[PDB]
From TrEMBL:
This is Rhamnose ABC transporter, rhamnose-binding protein. PANTHER family: ABC-TYPE SUGAR TRANSPORT SYSTEM PERIPLASMIC COMPONENT-LIKE PROTEIN, D-XYLOSE-BINDING PERIPLASMIC PROTEIN. InterPro entries: Bact_Solute-Bind_Prot2, Peripla_BP_I, RhaS, SBP_2_dom. GO terms for biological process: rhamnose transmembrane transport. It comes from the Bacteria. Residues 11-266 form the Periplasmic binding protein domain. Keywords: Signal. It comes from Schaalia dentiphila ATCC 17982.
């Protein structure tokens, strides 16, 4: 249990950058949770520009103000670390969400989704759409992208191991470099080199948007399936057209919600922040602290034509 007795305590949310549409949904969920808990002061401070050490001055400012709970989305895992370590020695409970810092600068980390689960969700959507077997191509971000290369590796391992995904044949691995013009050109060349393609997996919001724009304007509309990780606002039109049937991502509001309850649990004394401990995250139920003091919000949220108009990010 993650009890609430922080009626006199203060909570502050520091995003990567201020006034970011997707980041503001995460902050909104955090503020709503903090209100439910009953925090005395609920504040949102941060930089106007997302730079490695842009949050350092804001972390130090909150320590001077005597903030009890600090929820931060680290721009760089090492640059914000000395400021966050100074917060912990001052008595501030440091909770990281979305993007983590180093292991020794925070009391707890709240991750949206688990890496292997992202890969499983994508393979499940591919397998379901292609019909169990077919030629599939991957349109990733940059070649050196840490998150994408991790999801692709789990995907490749599951195809070789699990009998459920043995039918999925990866025939290409192209890189859009998180650029709309490059991702569009890569998708155009993908159908030129592989015209017998059944589907395209794009584990990038920029890549999936540019591939959807190409498929909807080409003869491959509805014929070549497109799935991966995307944004409801950008994908809305393509989901209704029939270019995209189902893609996945996550609800950022749930991440801020769990983080505010996690911080309240550490500050009240319900949890020490150890591996195996459990805390209540309001309406979302209980959560367990896993390895490297990490808490997972849940499985990736699947978006289709039945729930696309219910999310705005």
């Amino acid at each position: 249990s993650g009890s609430y007795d922080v009626s006199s305590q203060s909570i502050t949310f520091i995003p990567k950058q201020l006034n970011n549409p997707f980041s503001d949904v995460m902050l909104g969920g955090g503020k709503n949770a903090a209100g439910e808990i009953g925090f005395a002061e609920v504040n949102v401070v941060g930089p106007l520009e997302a730079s490695s050490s842009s949050q350092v001055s804001f972390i130090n400012s909150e320590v001077q103000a005597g903030t009890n709970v600090l929820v931060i989305a680290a721009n760089d895992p090492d640059a914000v670390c000395p400021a966050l370590q100074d917060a912990r020695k001052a008595g501030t409970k440091v909770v990281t969400f979305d993007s983590d810092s180093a292991a020794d600068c925070r009391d707890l980390f709240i991750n949206q989704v688990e890496s292997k689960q992202v890969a499983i969700t994508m393979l499940d959507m591919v397998s379901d759409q292609i019909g169990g077997s077919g030629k599939v191509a991957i349109l990733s971000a940059t070649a050196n992208a840490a998150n994408q290369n991790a999801w692709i590796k789990f995907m490749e391992d599951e195809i070789a191991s699990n009998d459920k995904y043995k039918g999925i044949e990866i025939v290409a691995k192209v890189y859009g470099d998180d650029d709309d013009t490059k991702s569009f050109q890569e998708a155009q060349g993908l159908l030129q080199a592989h015209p017998d393609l059944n589907a395209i997996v794009s584990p990038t919001t920029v890549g999936i948007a540019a591939t959807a724009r190409y498929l909807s304007t080409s003869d491959y509309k509805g014929k070549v399936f497109l799935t991966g990780l995307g944004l409801p606002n950008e994908m809305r039109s393509f989901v209704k057209d029939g270019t995209v049937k189902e893609f996945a991502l996550w609800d950022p509001a749930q991440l801020g919600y769990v983080a505010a309850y996690a911080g309240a649990a550490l500050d009240s004394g319900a949890i020490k922040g150890e591996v195996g401990e459990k805390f209540t995250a309001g309406n979302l139920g209980e959560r367990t602290i896993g390895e490297n003091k990490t808490v997972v919000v849940g499985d990736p949220v699947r978006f289709n034509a039945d729930n696309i108009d219910k999310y705005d990010f």
